[PDB]
Amino acid sequence: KILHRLLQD
Amino acid sequence: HKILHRLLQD
Amino acid sequence: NSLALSLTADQMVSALLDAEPPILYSEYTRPFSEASMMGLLTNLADRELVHMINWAKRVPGFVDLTLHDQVHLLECAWLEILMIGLVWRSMEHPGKLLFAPNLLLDRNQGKCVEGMVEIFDMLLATSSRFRMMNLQGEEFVCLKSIILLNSGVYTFKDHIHRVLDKITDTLIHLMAKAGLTLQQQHQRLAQLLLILSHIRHMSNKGMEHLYSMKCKNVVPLSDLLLEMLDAHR
Amino acid sequence: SLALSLTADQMVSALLDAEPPILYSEYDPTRPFSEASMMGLLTNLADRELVHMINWAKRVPGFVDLTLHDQVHLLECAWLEILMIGLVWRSMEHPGKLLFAPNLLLDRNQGKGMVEIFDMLLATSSRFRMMNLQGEEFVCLKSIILLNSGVYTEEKDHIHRVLDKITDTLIHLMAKAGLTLQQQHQRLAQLLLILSHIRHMSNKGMEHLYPLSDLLLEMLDAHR
Ligand SMILES: O=S(=O)([C@@H]1C[C@@H]2O[C@H]1C(c1ccc(O)cc1)=C2c1ccc(O)cc1)N(CC(F)(F)F)c1ccccc1
Numbered sequence: 001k002i003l004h005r006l007l008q009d
Numbered sequence: 010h011k012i013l014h015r016l017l018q019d
Numbered sequence: 020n021s022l023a024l025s026l027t028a029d030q031m032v033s034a035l036l037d038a039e040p041p042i043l044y045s046e047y048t049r050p051f052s053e054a055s056m057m058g059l060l061t062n063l064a065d066r067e068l069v070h071m072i073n074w075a076k077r078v079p080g081f082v083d084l085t086l087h088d089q090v091h092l093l094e095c096a097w098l099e100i101l102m103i104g105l106v107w108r109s110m111e112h113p114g115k116l117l118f119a120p121n122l123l124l125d126r127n128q129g130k131c132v133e134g135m136v137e138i139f140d141m142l143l144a145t146s147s148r149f150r151m152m153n154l155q156g157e158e159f160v161c162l163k164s165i166i167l168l169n170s171g172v173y174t175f176k177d178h179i180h181r182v183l184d185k186i187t188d189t190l191i192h193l194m195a196k197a198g199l200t201l202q203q204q205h206q207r208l209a210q211l212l213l214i215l216s217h218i219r220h221m222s223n224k225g226m227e228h229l230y231s232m233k234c235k236n237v238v239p240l241s242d243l244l245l246e247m248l249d250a251h252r
Numbered sequence: 253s254l255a256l257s258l259t260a261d262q263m264v265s266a267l268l269d270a271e272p273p274i275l276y277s278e279y280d281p282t283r284p285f286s287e288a289s290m291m292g293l294l295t296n297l298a299d300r301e302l303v304h305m306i307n308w309a310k311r312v313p314g315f316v317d318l319t320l321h322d323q324v325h326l327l328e329c330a331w332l333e334i335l336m337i338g339l340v341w342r343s344m345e346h347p348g349k350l351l352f353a354p355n356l357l358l359d360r361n362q363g364k365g366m367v368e369i370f371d372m373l374l375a376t377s378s379r380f381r382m383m384n385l386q387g388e389e390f391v392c393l394k395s396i397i398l399l400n401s402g403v404y405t406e407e408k409d410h411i412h413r414v415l416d417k418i419t420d421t422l423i424h425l426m427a428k429a430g431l432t433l434q435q436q437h438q439r440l441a442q443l444l445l446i447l448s449h450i451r452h453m454s455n456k457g458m459e460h461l462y463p464l465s466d467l468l469l470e471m472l473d474a475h476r
Pocket residue numbers: 291294295296297298301332335336338339352365366369370453454456457458460461464468472
């Protein structure tokens with residue numbers, strides 16, 4: 001999930 | 010109209 | 020002017036308690052199929068609706084609305100009201116949903132239909148939340164009336180909001196009486212009202228499933244249920 | 253750790269500082285409007301707002317204390333609600349209009365199954381206006397949605413304690429504005445009940461959708 005990456009710096 | 014009307018008046 | 024406003028807190032509580040509908044029984048069984056599942060629930064919900072309408076007319080402030088506004092509120096709120104009722108009487112049966120005294124169900128049964136399990140679990144979490152909060156009957160009937168008045172009022176005036184205010188006052192009065200501090204009072208008030216958001220969500224998801232069930236002919240649904248349903252399309 | 257040690261004023265400061273910017277749309281007021289273009293513009297906007305929303309969420313007290321799996325779930329559950337309450341807030345001073353962006357101010361007419369949702373958003377904006385919702389209250393409400401919306405679907409306890417702190421903050425804000433105790437509790441209830449119409453709007457929105465960026469599709473996923 002892109003959301004999951006964006007949540008990581 | 011609707012049953013609901015009948016039920017609300019009665 | 021409305022008589023509802025002039026009621027004291029205890030009078031409001033006593034009125035709401037006295038207005039409570041009865042706990043109905045389903046047909047007299049398991050195991051279950053999708054058709055027989057929806058058959059019992061539809062039959063039961065239909066009879067519950069007739070009592071809900073007579074209950075709603077006894078909620079202080081409701082009689083003061085026009086017939087059209089009464090219709091609108093009940094059309095918007097009815098599944099929410101059936102659900103909070105279900106959750107309330109399921110409290111004492113952790114892990115179960117007490118649809119009727121003779122129809123107590125768990126998740127496994129929820130497989131029965133399509134989408135029932137997800138709603139099932141949401142209903143169970145709500146029930147558990149009510150139990151862990153030790154929700155009192157007096158609080159419960161305040162919450163249920165709030166749902167009736169609130170749920171449709173943004174889709175229409177000030178009368179409804181003053182009555183809602185009166186019920187807020189009544190919830191706080193109940194909590195003060197139970198010994199809660201000022202901070203505990205506001206905190207609990209917020210917690211209870213936020214759960215109403217989740218009850219709205221369950222009803223929304225529930226309602227689109229009842230729509231699809233109309234849109235198979237899975238089961239016969241009454242004219243009354245159809246027109247309650249159609250108000251949400 | 254520190255979310256439960258903040259004073260109410262610190263909580264308000266934290267939330268206000270975390271506020272995302274107001275983004276512009278690509279509306280070109282010459283272009284004839286398609287149905288497809290209007291949705292194109294809104295999708296483009298929402299997608300960019302999502303990036304700021306994700307980074308705003310990290311700054312909501314308590315949110316980074318949650319596991320990453322839980323952060324994802326909350327944002328998946330709440331993103332449309334959060335976009336919607338932002339829209340309603342910036343639309344407050346524009347009766348009968350929705351300020352999607354400073355350069356994109358639409359009325360019901362330009363809606364149109366979007367008209368139905370637009371009407372509800374307008375009503376919500378009308379309600380905030382009537383209540384004279386304050387910025388400090390708004391940022392509390394928006395943080396509540398984030399924490400609340402997915403919470404019911406052992407670490408649940410941390411979220412509820414943070415929710416309690418935000419309630420304390422709302423109450424603090426109202427006592428400072430001179431409201432009696434009765435008034436505080438009434439207004440508190442009034443604001444929270446709105447969150448339930450808002451949940452309603454978000455769900456009806458999803459329903460009506462059934463032209464989308466990769467991020468939107470991944471989050472639009474979590475409601476089916
Ligand atoms: O809820 S909707 O109206 C939605 C709400 C409002 O208008 C639609 C919309 C929107 C959002 C995302 C998008 O890709 C397109 C449209 C809105 C929006 C609100 C605040 C913002 O800051 C940015 C955008 N919707 C669902 C959504 F958002 F998922 F697209 C929708 C779409 C098509 C038809 C009917 C409803």
